[PDB]
Design a protein around this ligand. Structure first.
Ligand SMILES: [Cu+2]
Length: 153
């Protein structure tokens, strides 16, 4: 079974958005997603958020994550969840909204399996203002410090 992942958002001069998006392997071949965010800016939401294709660099410049993770060439607007880009979490599941936002859902398209074409490990998540402006972003990293079948964490 594939390991859990997390994206940790930190507050800076650029953004007050902080919190986490957790990705945990679940039943029925899906991934459980847990969003817990605060400090979302006044009135420029709702906030689309997506898995992007490159890491956040040390500069924390969210532009450097480049485009959406879209291995199966999906579309931004769709009539069924699977037609969306794999990385388009908000399009499938709803935009972030409010000053604080907590939600849990299953996504059946992202993968925690590094041998999968839909693997999202090592990628990033960007949160946008409604007009598309990139507000904050975080790398998707390993959640637990200890792994292996003879270990504890
Ligand atoms: Cu995006």
């Amino acid at each position: 079974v594939s390991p859990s992942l997390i994206a940790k958002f930190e507050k800076t001069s650029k953004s007050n958005i902080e919190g986490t998006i957790k990705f945990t392997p679940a039943n029925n071949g899906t991934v459980s997603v847990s969003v817990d965010l605060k400090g979302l800016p006044s009135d420029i939401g709702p906030f689309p958020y997506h898995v992007h294709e490159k890491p956040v660099p040390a500069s924390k410049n969210c532009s450097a994550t480049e485009n959406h993770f879209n291995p199966y060439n999906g579309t931004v607007r769709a009539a069924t969840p699977a037609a969306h880009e794999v990385g388009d979490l908000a399009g499938k599941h709803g935009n972030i909204m409010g000053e604080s936002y907590k939600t849990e859902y299953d996504d059946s398209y992202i993968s925690l399996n590094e041998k999968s074409r839909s693997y999202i490990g090592g990628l990033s998540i960007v949160i946008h203002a409604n007009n598309g402006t990139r507000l904050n972003c975080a790398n998707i990293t390993l959640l637990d410090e200890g792994h292996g079948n003879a270990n504890t964490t």
